[PDB]
Amino acid sequence: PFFDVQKKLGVDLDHWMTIQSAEQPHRIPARCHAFEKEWIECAHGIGSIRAEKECKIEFEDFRECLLRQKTMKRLNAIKRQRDKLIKEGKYTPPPHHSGQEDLRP
Amino acid sequence: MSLVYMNIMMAFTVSLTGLLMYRSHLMSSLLCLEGMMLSLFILATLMILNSHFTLASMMPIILLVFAACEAALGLSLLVMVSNTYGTDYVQNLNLLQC
Amino acid sequence: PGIVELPSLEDLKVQEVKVSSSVLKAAAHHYGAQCDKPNKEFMLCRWEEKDPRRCLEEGKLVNQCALEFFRQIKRHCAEPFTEYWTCIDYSGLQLFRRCRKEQAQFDKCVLDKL
Amino acid sequence: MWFEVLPGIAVMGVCLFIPGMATARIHRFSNGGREKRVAHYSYQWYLMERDRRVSGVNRYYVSKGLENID
Amino acid sequence: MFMINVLTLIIPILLAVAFLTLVERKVLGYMQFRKGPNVVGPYGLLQPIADAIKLFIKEPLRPATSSISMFILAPILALTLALTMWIPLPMPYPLINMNLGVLFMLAMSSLAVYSILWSGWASNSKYALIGALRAVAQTISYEVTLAIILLSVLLMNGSFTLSTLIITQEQVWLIFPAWPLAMMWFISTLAETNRAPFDLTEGESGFNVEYAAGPFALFFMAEYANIIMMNIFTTTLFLGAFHNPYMPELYTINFTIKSLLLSITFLWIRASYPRFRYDQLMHLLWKNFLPLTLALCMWHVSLPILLSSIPPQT
Amino acid sequence: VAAFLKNVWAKEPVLVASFAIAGLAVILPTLSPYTKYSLMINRATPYNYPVPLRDDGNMPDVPSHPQDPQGPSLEWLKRL
Amino acid sequence: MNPIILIIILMTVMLGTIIVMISTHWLLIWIGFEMNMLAIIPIMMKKHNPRATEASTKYFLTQSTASMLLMMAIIINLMFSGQWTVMKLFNPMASMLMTMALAMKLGMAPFHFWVPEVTQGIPLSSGLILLTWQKLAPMSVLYQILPSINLDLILTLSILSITIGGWGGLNQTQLRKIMAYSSIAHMGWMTAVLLYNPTMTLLNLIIYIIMTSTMFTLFMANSTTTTLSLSHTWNKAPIMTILVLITLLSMGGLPPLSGFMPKWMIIQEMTKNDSIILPTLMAITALLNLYFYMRLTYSTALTMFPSTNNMKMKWQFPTTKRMTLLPTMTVLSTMLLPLTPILSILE
Amino acid sequence: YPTKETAHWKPPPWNDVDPPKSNLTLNFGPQGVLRLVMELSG
Amino acid sequence: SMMRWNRERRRLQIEDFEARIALMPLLQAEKDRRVLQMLRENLEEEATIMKDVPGWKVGESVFHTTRWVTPMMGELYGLRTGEEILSSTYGFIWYT
Amino acid sequence: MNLMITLLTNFTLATLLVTIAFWLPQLNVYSEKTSPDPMGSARLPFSMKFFLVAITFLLFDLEIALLLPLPWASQTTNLNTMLTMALLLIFLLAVSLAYEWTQKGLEWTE
Amino acid sequence: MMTYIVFILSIIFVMGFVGFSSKPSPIYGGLGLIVSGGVGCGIVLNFGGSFLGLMVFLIYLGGMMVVFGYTTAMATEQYNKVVLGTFITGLLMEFLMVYYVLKDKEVEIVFKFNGMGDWVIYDTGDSGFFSEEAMGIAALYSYGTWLVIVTGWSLLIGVVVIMEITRGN
Numbered sequence A: 001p002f003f004d005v006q007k008k009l010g011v012d013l014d015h016w017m018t019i020q021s022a023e024q025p026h027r028i029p030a031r032c033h034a035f036e037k038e039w040i041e042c043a044h045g046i047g048s049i050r051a052e053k054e055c056k057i058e059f060e061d062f063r064e065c066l067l068r069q070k071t072m073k074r075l076n077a078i079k080r081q082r083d084k085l086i087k088e089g090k091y092t093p094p095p096h097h098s099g100q101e102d103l104r105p
Numbered sequence B: 001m002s003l004v005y006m007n008i009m010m011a012f013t014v015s016l017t018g019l020l021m022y023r024s025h026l027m028s029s030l031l032c033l034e035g036m037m038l039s040l041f042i043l044a045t046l047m048i049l050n051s052h053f054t055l056a057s058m059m060p061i062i063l064l065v066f067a068a069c070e071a072a073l074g075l076s077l078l079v080m081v082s083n084t085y086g087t088d089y090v091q092n093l094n095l096l097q098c
Numbered sequence C: 001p002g003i004v005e006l007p008s009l010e011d012l013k014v015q016e017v018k019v020s021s022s023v024l025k026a027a028a029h030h031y032g033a034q035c036d037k038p039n040k041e042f043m044l045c046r047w048e049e050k051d052p053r054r055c056l057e058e059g060k061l062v063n064q065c066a067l068e069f070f071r072q073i074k075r076h077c078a079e080p081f082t083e084y085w086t087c088i089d090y091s092g093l094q095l096f097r098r099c100r101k102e103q104a105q106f107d108k109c110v111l112d113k114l
Numbered sequence D: 001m002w003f004e005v006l007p008g009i010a011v012m013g014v015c016l017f018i019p020g021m022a023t024a025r026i027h028r029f030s031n032g033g034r035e036k037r038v039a040h041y042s043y044q045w046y047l048m049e050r051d052r053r054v055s056g057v058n059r060y061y062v063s064k065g066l067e068n069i070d
Numbered sequence E: 001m002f003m004i005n006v007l008t009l010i011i012p013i014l015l016a017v018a019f020l021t022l023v024e025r026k027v028l029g030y031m032q033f034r035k036g037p038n039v040v041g042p043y044g045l046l047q048p049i050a051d052a053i054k055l056f057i058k059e060p061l062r063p064a065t066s067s068i069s070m071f072i073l074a075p076i077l078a079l080t081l082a083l084t085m086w087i088p089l090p091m092p093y094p095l096i097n098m099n100l101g102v103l104f105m106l107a108m109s110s111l112a113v114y115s116i117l118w119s120g121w122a123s124n125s126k127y128a129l130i131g132a133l134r135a136v137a138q139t140i141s142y143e144v145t146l147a148i149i150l151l152s153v154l155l156m157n158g159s160f161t162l163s164t165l166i167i168t169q170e171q172v173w174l175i176f177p178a179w180p181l182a183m184m185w186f187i188s189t190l191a192e193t194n195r196a197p198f199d200l201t202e203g204e205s206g207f208n209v210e211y212a213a214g215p216f217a218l219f220f221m222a223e224y225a226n227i228i229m230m231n232i233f234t235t236t237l238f239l240g241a242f243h244n245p246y247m248p249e250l251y252t253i254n255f256t257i258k259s260l261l262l263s264i265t266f267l268w269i270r271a272s273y274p275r276f277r278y279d280q281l282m283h284l285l286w287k288n289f290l291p292l293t294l295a296l297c298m299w300h301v302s303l304p305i306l307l308s309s310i311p312p313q314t
Numbered sequence F: 001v002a003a004f005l006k007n008v009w010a011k012e013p014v015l016v017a018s019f020a021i022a023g024l025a026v027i028l029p030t031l032s033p034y035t036k037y038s039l040m041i042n043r044a045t046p047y048n049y050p051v052p053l054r055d056d057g058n059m060p061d062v063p064s065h066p067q068d069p070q071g072p073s074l075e076w077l078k079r080l
Numbered sequence G: 001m002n003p004i005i006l007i008i009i010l011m012t013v014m015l016g017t018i019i020v021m022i023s024t025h026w027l028l029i030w031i032g033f034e035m036n037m038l039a040i041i042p043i044m045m046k047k048h049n050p051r052a053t054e055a056s057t058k059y060f061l062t063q064s065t066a067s068m069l070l071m072m073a074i075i076i077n078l079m080f081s082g083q084w085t086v087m088k089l090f091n092p093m094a095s096m097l098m099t100m101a102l103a104m105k106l107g108m109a110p111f112h113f114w115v116p117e118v119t120q121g122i123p124l125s126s127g128l129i130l131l132t133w134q135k136l137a138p139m140s141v142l143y144q145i146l147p148s149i150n151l152d153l154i155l156t157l158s159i160l161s162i163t164i165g166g167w168g169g170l171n172q173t174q175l176r177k178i179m180a181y182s183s184i185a186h187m188g189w190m191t192a193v194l195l196y197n198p199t200m201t202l203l204n205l206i207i208y209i210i211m212t213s214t215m216f217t218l219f220m221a222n223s224t225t226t227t228l229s230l231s232h233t234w235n236k237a238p239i240m241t242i243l244v245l246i247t248l249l250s251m252g253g254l255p256p257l258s259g260f261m262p263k264w265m266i267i268q269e270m271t272k273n274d275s276i277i278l279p280t281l282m283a284i285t286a287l288l289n290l291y292f293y294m295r296l297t298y299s300t301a302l303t304m305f306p307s308t309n310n311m312k313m314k315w316q317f318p319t320t321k322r323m324t325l326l327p328t329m330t331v332l333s334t335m336l337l338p339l340t341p342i343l344s345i346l347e
Numbered sequence H: 001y002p003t004k005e006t007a008h009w010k011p012p013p014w015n016d017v018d019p020p021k022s023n024l025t026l027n028f029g030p031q032g033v034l035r036l037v038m039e040l041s042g
Numbered sequence I: 001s002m003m004r005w006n007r008e009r010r011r012l013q014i015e016d017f018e019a020r021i022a023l024m025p026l027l028q029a030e031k032d033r034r035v036l037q038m039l040r041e042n043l044e045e046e047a048t049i050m051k052d053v054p055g056w057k058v059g060e061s062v063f064h065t066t067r068w069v070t071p072m073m074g075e076l077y078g079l080r081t082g083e084e085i086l087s088s089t090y091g092f093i094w095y096t
Numbered sequence J: 001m002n003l004m005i006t007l008l009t010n011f012t013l014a015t016l017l018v019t020i021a022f023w024l025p026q027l028n029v030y031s032e033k034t035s036p037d038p039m040g041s042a043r044l045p046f047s048m049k050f051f052l053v054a055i056t057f058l059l060f061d062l063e064i065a066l067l068l069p070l071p072w073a074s075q076t077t078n079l080n081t082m083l084t085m086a087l088l089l090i091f092l093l094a095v096s097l098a099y100e101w102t103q104k105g106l107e108w109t110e
Numbered sequence K: 001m002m003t004y005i006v007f008i009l010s011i012i013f014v015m016g017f018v019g020f021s022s023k024p025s026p027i028y029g030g031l032g033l034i035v036s037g038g039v040g041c042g043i044v045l046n047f048g049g050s051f052l053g054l055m056v057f058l059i060y061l062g063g064m065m066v067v068f069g070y071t072t073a074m075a076t077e078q079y080n081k082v083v084l085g086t087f088i089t090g091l092l093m094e095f096l097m098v099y100y101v102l103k104d105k106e107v108e109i110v111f112k113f114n115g116m117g118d119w120v121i122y123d124t125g126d127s128g129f130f131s132e133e134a135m136g137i138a139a140l141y142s143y144g145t146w147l148v149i150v151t152g153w154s155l156l157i158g159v160v161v162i163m164e165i166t167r168g169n
């Protein structure tokens, strides 16, 4: 049994912590505020069964923001190809990627 | 995902297998339990700090407080059984087989 | 999925405000007072569009206005401002309370000149 | 009489004056004749790194003022 | 370049410890109607050198230790934690500027009891173990009031940063608004470093009875470094000095004088009163110091709100 | 009620002082007239950016410049 | 034990259960669990004999392991979802860890090894508190997370619990161990019907709570902890023998008693989802629980075991125990079958 | 059903109370002078 | 004395914060231009490198949306030397 | 960076001093000693008082960990709530101390 | 190799966990747990959590493991193949996992892990004039009223419980 005492009484005992996109002190944003907001605006009011299938792409984007497996895999592939081309000797790194750029500001 | 997450999961699994196989003493079981809590602390803290979840930063303090109260209760129980039998061996806690 | 669009390297080209942190801190109040309109336009565009590629031109205008602010400072009040940002720059935490006298001198000079 | 404890207290006072004076002199010497800059928060560190990038020497205490703008 | 700073921090600590031994002997002598050492050198200036060489050529005890690992490790921890509690001290600029230097010091002081525990357990004597357990209990029980007093004092500062503690006392000394906390803090630091009238291990077995003369000297040197560090911390907390940003030598000389006076007050305390019993100091802590510390903690939480005097966060 | 206080102040003065300090600490902030000053000093500290609002046409209260007369004032903080 | 301290500790146990029931945050679920366990430990050690300390030690170790597994599942769910709302879980590993943590807390087989020893080592009132109140919170947490529960895992745990409970209770002579194995079998039934209709689980939980409370209250009323001391009751108070006979018949699910209704509705629900082998197997296995219940009724009510001489000295005095709510739960556990459609209030 | 494994299994006590299964002595030697033998209870 | 000095310190802190508020629009513009330049340079070098592999699209976003996402630290400094990586990621934490 | 350099320097200086303090009289060849506590072979007596004061310290240390963020928390806008929660926490500290006091918890180590 | 500092610290953490989890003796287990807690606090500090790492040092190590070793000194009177065997095999699985991680820059055991350095996940922006974790902890007295109430009640009840069960009556 889940007795919703808080909704019956109007108190707010643990809803402030329950999500990351909630009211945070000093208006500090999280890394995945937008993705979580979009996923919540999907799943609200349609139940879990419909929300598990209807706009799953919002949840995939949220999970990709959270854990970042695809970005890590893409960086791994790019760096592996760069290492292979560097060792076989047909790629020269640019000056700005070797610490000789004298950055903008 | 990341790598230090894998290391903290493997540390938790090592401490869990240590707890789940007693050797001789109850104190070693308590130490394995508290190492499990420490691994939970590190994992949750790293996830919360990397995710920039500001309001979740209070959770590991509450986790530490509650599990240290748990450990105080366990130490009191260990002291009671040591006063009963003269040692904290796990082979003396076998009266309730009958 | 899609292909992320980035501006070309010529669109990111602008001449910069090449001054240090204490030089910016010494004239920070007058920079906020004088150059407020393009800064607030850029900040409104930034908080509304949520995309720097849609605020590149406003940032360019912000750079132009700041550069003209410092050119106007250099024309009339170079020496008191130089002393003020020097004594600001000596401090480790860059305090405003350790340099009240030079601050008053710079404020008086720029009030009667500009 | 009682003033003979004073050589030992003087040696102790010298040995306690040494670390603070050495630290202040090292911080002033290594940071171009200025105090060591405090960076307790990320905004102050961002100002540190911006000043290092704008120095042109890769050195955060070489501060350039009105001589750089056109 | 930084290693020069580290070396000029840590070598004068050992020099000041040796001359603290000499100064304490001479001051106790002149306070007991006699003289201290004045034969070994001019006014005893060569006494620590002779004593150190004698202790470093002494025969070792060679005990039947239960564990040689922690027998080695206890002086290691004692000396490392004695030397590592100096790096966030502002003199007026700390060697390692820490955002949370005060709580870092609290963590190191709380960690310092493992030397006592391991030295007691490594020795085979059970009476040595009992003495070590009693010393550990006294040490942690005074850690409690150290933490509460530091927490209540910091509410006038606004952060845990040790360098801001100079800025807070730019107007008046912090002993004026927090003198009961200052008295309780001084007694708690006196009982923290195991000094008279709380040095129960010298009254009727110590925790390091089986330790050799060399490691005993290392333990004693760590204890004296702890004494000097605690007095410097007390001076920074309650007796802050005037710091000119163009002349740091003024602050260095001023707090050096004040901390030397506080350490001489430690030696003055140690030769005036009889020792406490164990239950008497437990009564003094759990039943006298703790309720007043809690009351003053509540007072110093609720006071800056009602005075519109919340210190700035940064 | 009256002799009890005298007896307990002659016998345990430390507990009397502790309880008196505790009572002062718990009844004084509700009685002082400076708590509201702490409230509006804490709420007037500018931690983050004051993001501007797009001018639709009807905001007489919102200033168009920092030096404009309309807007919140900290003269009470400057004087106190 | 002080009456006031006992009152505060009991309200702390109920406060922990309430905190688990009403909260929407996983950390608050964890906090309520530790508050409940920490407060209930001194109820077990009321008498201060080595058996109570041994039972308390085993209970503490099991609950701490289950609690650490629960925190692990919560942290994994936070890592893979970024939130803490008590609802369906977003990882199969988190779901498996949480399901096994709740199974360890409930004492279902094969995590059942702590239940009979712990129940034997503690008094009858604390054993009643344990086996009745301690199971309200894990079943509520299971009631909140059923979209994420693996079906094979929970059904395996259920059938294992039922078989192991029946086979374990076949051999016992102490009453507390019999009650523990009976509890294990009933939680097997409750989590068997969980994924199809949790309202049937709530109804079975309520009926089992009432029947267990009646049996334990009769046990402390007669101050009997063994089979033979219970068999002495016919020469002291035969109305109690009639009451334990009807309650033990109702505990076995024999119609038309009120214990028939939970398994009847569970079998009704399981056949709607085309599961016919499992309800038949569970009924055939519950025949073993009926067997040792009927053995107890043989030893207590339907025969007259020999008594001793001092039973006369016990005849000369009346009872003064506060048998609280004993007639109410005696009636409600036997003659509630004609009010079977009352289960719609639990939906 | 007693088996070979369940042969040493005694019944529990009637009151469920198991039996609980001295003080320190110190020899303060001569290390005026005096030897002491102390029977201490904590 | 503490009340007067702490009120003055609060006023000084407010002045410092409002100076930072006046400054930071320019820093925001500079940071945006710098990160856009870093992304453009990394994309061009990826176009130069990622050529032999079949079925590789240069500059393909990993998300299903076209909303701007704040770049990772490994997305900017992933193609540079280890000294800049150490100075950017662990530079603030390790600073004394 | 500089902090762990200083930590390593302190650790290696301490271990250097300890190594010289140990192994330097080892180079002496003084003698071989046979050597054949007031209690000879008595078991350590288990005292509930020392364990009780240890557990009381641990619990008060936990409530200290709760009390620690007060200087940061005093800067909140909700000052009435923060003041009430702080006073409630220190009042719970005082109540636990008073319960230990009244039930003879601080007895013979007062 | 300096970019892999948190990874190396995690390796030391899990190695200490293998060492103390082999249960050689309760005091040696306590020493290994103290070392592992120090290394884990180093991990948290290198990730940016100064306050949480200093809480680990102040409360876990300086305040609680002291109690654990203090109880260990009051039992387990002072003076194996299994301990060495499990230590060796745990070191073997650990170093095999490290080699398989670093050889292919990807691994799967239960979840999928990536072998790159863990500096990639960091955030490229600044936090302004405050630290985020300190504000999150400081919001306990303003937001976490209920959390404060339940934690303080549990602590007081724990004091009462410990006083109850150690009395023996």
Ligand SMILES: CCCCCCCCCCCCCCCCCC(=O)OC[C@H](COP(=O)([O-])OCC[N+](C)(C)C)OC(=O)CCCCCCCCCCCCCCCCC
Residues within 6 Å of the ligand: E180, E182, E183, E184, E186, E187, E197, E234, E238, E269, E273, E284, E288, E289, E292, F011, F012, F014, F016, F017, F020, F021, F024
């Ligand atoms: C750092 C600055 C310098 C610090 C001082 C250094 C020099 C002084 C050194 C003194 C000697 C030190 C060696 C001995 C140490 C051990 C003895 C010791 O300290 O015992 C402490 C003694 C112990 O008390 P006790 O044991 O005598 O108490 C008797 C208790 N019974 C009866 C149960 C036995 O006193 C205290 O603990 C008091 C602490 C300080 C109290 C400060 C109160 C401030 C005023 C509050 C308000 C009062 C008015 C009423 C309310 C008004 C409200 C508006």
Ligand SMILES: CCCCCCCCCCCCCCCCCC(=O)OC[C@H](COP(=O)(O)OCCN)OC(=O)CCCCCCCCCCCCCCCCC
Residues within 6 Å of the ligand: D011, D014, D015, E015, E041, E042, E045, E046
């Ligand atoms: C930060 C500051 C720290 C300061 C620490 C030190 C403080 C005290 C400083 C020294 C005070 C004076 C010491 C004087 C010692 C005795 C000197 C002397 O005259 O010795 C004579 C002795 C025998 O000579 P002989 O030739 O036999 O005589 C026949 C002739 N009629 O000959 C001998 O015994 C042999 C020669 C001995 C020479 C000893 C000289 C002093 C040694 C001091 C060591 C420490 C120096 C400072 C180190 C730190 C700073 C660099």
Ligand SMILES: CCCCCCCCCCCCCCCCCC(=O)OC[C@H](COP(=O)(O)OCCN)OC(=O)CCCCCCCCCCCCCCCCC
Residues within 6 Å of the ligand: E039, E040, E046, E048, E049, E050, E052, E053
């Ligand atoms: C290769 C060649 C070198 C070989 C190794 C030797 C290195 C140098 C060692 C020190 C010098 C050697 C001579 C030592 C003293 C010999 C002369 C002597 O006995 O002088 C006695 C004189 C005091 O006379 P006294 O008999 O005490 O009379 C009492 C008053 N009626 O005494 C005095 O006046 C004072 C004597 C002071 C001795 C020197 C100072 C102490 C040692 C300093 C160096 C070593 C320690 C450095 C610091 C270590 C850490 C503490």
Ligand SMILES: CCCCCCCCCCCCCCCCCC(=O)OC[C@H](COP(=O)(O)OCCN)OC(=O)CCCCCCCCCCCCCCCCC
Residues within 6 Å of the ligand: D039, D040, D041, E073, E076, E077, E080, E081, E084, E097, E098, E099, E100, E101, E104, I092, I093, I094, I095, I096, J001, J003, J004, J007, J011, K034, K035, K037, K038, K039, K041, K042, K043, K045, K046, K050, K053, K054
């Ligand atoms: C028996 C074994 C041996 C025993 C003797 C030796 C060990 C014990 C004695 C030494 C104890 C050292 C404790 C080190 C951690 C202390 C906390 C700390 O580092 O605080 C300083 C700082 C946090 O302050 P903050 O100002 O916020 O940081 C800069 C922000 N701009 O944080 C930083 O600046 C972070 C810097 C990067 C991370 C540093 C990590 C250090 C290495 C890991 C821990 C080492 C000790 C391990 C063993 C523990 C004890 C067994």
Ligand SMILES: CCCCCCCCCCCCCCCCCC(=O)OC[C@H](COP(=O)(O)OCCN)OC(=O)CCCCCCCCCCCCCCCCC
Residues within 6 Å of the ligand: E291, E292, E294, E295, F008, F012, F015, F016, F017, F018, F019, F020, F022, F023, F026, J091, J094, J095, J097, J098, J101
């Ligand atoms: C409501 C205010 C806020 C309350 C919360 C905050 C409290 C802060 C202080 C915390 C103190 C914690 C410990 C308190 C223990 C009190 C109980 C006690 O110790 O009773 C025993 C003692 C007699 O001593 P004895 O039995 O011999 O014990 C051995 C020591 N001699 O008995 C005594 O000495 C008598 C103690 C009880 C009477 C004290 C009366 C003090 C009155 C001061 C003036 C009024 C202050 C305003 C508040 C109302 C107080 C009633």
Ligand SMILES: CCCCCCCCCCCCCCCCCC(=O)OC[C@H](COP(=O)(O)OCCN)OC(=O)CCCCCCCCCCCCCCCCC
Residues within 6 Å of the ligand: A001, G010, G125, G126, G128, G129, G132, G133, G136, G202, G206, G209, G210, G213, G217, G220, G322, G323, G324, G325, G329
């Ligand atoms: C979806 C569902 C949500 C939740 C719905 C509500 C669920 C209610 C669950 C009730 C659980 C009851 C737990 C056990 C009783 C609790 C009270 C207690 O502490 O009783 C023990 C106490 C010990 O006192 P002592 O004197 O030591 O006893 C030894 C004998 N001399 O005192 C005694 O031993 C006194 C002797 C009589 C005790 C009688 C206790 C009867 C309690 C159960 C009543 C019936 C169940 C509740 C109503 C129906 C709920 C479905």
Ligand SMILES: CCCCCCCCCCC1=C(C)C(=O)C(OC)=C(OC)C1=O
Residues within 6 Å of the ligand: E014, E017, E018, E021, E022, E025, E047, E048, E051, E052, E055, E216, E217, E220, E221
């Ligand atoms: C690097 C090594 C420096 C030397 C060691 C520390 C200084 C020597 C302390 C010797 C000492 C002195 C002088 C001393 O007077 C004394 O009595 C209180 C001791 O304790 C019994 C001592 O240990």
